[PDB]
Design a protein around this ligand. Structure first.
Ligand SMILES: OC[C@H]1O[C@H](Oc2c[nH]c3ccc(Br)c(Cl)c23)[C@@H](O)[C@@H](O)[C@@H]1O
Ligand SMILES: OC[C@H]1O[C@H](Oc2c[nH]c3ccc(Br)c(Cl)c23)[C@@H](O)[C@@H](O)[C@@H]1O
Ligand SMILES: [Ca+2]
Ligand SMILES: [Ca+2]
Ligand SMILES: [Mn+2]
Ligand SMILES: [Mn+2]
Lengths: 231, 231
């Protein structure tokens, strides 16, 4: 499997290179983020994540913010053409471990362009109770509110621990081609994280992977349902 | 099966309600077009088709033109919410019968919006030799030029008769929902039709259908690979 991800990491796992505080990170083929940034978490408040990449600039960048408050950013120099395959699926992923949190997605948009001019764009603001244009993996599901719940949440509303789930867009994305001048993509998603216990965990991610990607075994909690190993 | 289609009909089949000349038509659940318009065919010249629908206006409209020349239009009043299911696949289809024609697609774009604001948009200008975001049916394939050939064409370049093929977009489209204020879609495609023989046949169509749609049996030639019967 080949994962490129932007992680909202709500729980620090110092035992695997994680900084000892909530952070946003850029993950290339490994949970140990190539670049992290301090995440000013606001549990209970709706947040927005924006992700951008351009094949000429070769800089993968992400920003996190809450309405009427300071934002935080992270960037990493990388040629994803030498990392990812030509065809990929894009998705959201989330996990809980010992510590719980709701991982609610209120909206999710993605745009990709490939000049050789081929484009794909999708935007979800309400998720149907049966999203045929989404591949739901793990414990991911959509509630009556039209929200996408990535991890387990009881009928009451409180999150469950040791949960893992993901949502992929159904159509593969031609992320780059050998006969391409420039390829670019932008993604955004709005999230709501609520936690009853003290420390929230584990986090939410946006990820690009090979088409046949699925939740690898033992990828719960700290590994955000993307990687089978910490290495 | 449930078909809504815009047909570029290059060969008149009067024996099934067809007007006795090349025409553009709007087809609702039947090859016998609810509305047709005179098509000023120009074989060998690249043409463009544009299709539009809005759930408030309830008027499905289509236009055909060639560069630097007069265009032709057709429209039909219809509530597609009462015709189509909520989830559909969009595709292109083409056939040949006794008389042949190349059915080349140079570009294909589609946009759909569903306010309840969910959107899907895709645009193809070059078709990969292995389009994983397309479902190719019948004899449909992509050539080295990056063009989408819907019907059989020999290694030389001349078209074959009794051919049928279609290309669907991989992801289903939430075309309408019960909790929707307005739904709309726009589609466009650029085509090249060349024919060695006298009269070209049979035509090209853009169609919206149920997700599990496939080429029905005995839908060759006049039926444009959409319908199993003329009724
Ligand atoms: O050393 C390996 C490669 O590094 C550079 O290309 C890049 C790989 N990732 C990048 C990220 C940003 C930029 Br700007 C460049 Cl220019 C690169 C260039 O120096 C290449 O010539 C070189 O093959
Ligand atoms: O008679 C059946 C229906 O026809 C109209 O609705 C439409 C069905 N297809 C259309 C196409 C265009 C327009 Br404009 C309308 Cl207003 C419609 C309305 O008159 C409806 O009240 C009625 O139930
Ligand atoms: Ca962590
Ligand atoms: Ca005909
Ligand atoms: Mn981390
Ligand atoms: Mn006709």
């Amino acid at each position: 499997d080949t994962i490129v991800a932007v992680e909202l990491d709500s729980y620090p796992n110092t035992d695997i290179g994680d900084p000892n505080y909530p952070h946003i990170g850029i993950d290339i083929k490994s949970i140990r983020s190539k670049s992290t940034a301090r995440w000013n978490m606001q549990t209970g408040k709706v947040g927005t994540v924006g992700i951008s990449y351009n094949s000429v600039a070769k800089r993968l960048s992400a920003v996190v913010s809450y309405s009427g408050s300071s934002s935080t950013t992270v960037s990493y120099d990388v040629d994803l053409n030498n990392v990812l395959p030509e065809w990929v699926r894009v998705g959201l992923s989330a996990t809980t471990g010992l510590y719980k949190e709701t991982n609610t997605i209120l909206s999710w948009s993605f745009t990709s362009k490939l000049k050789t001019e081929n484009s794909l764009h999708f935007s979800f603001n309400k998720f149907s109770q049966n999203p045929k244009d989404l591949i739901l993996q793990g414990d991911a599901f959509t509630d009556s509110d039209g929200n996408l719940q990535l991890t387990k949440v009881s009928s009451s509303g409180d999150p469950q621990g040791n949960s893992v789930g993901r949502a992929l867009f159904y159509a593969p994305v031609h992320i780059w081609e050998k006969s391409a001048v420039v390829a670019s993509f932008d993604a955004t998603f709005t999230f709501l994280i609520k936690s009853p216990d003290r420390e929230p965990a584990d986090g939410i991610t946006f990820f690009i992977a090979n088409t046949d990607t699925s939740i690898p075994s033992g990828s719960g909690g700290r590994l955000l349902g993307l990687f089978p190993d910490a290495n």
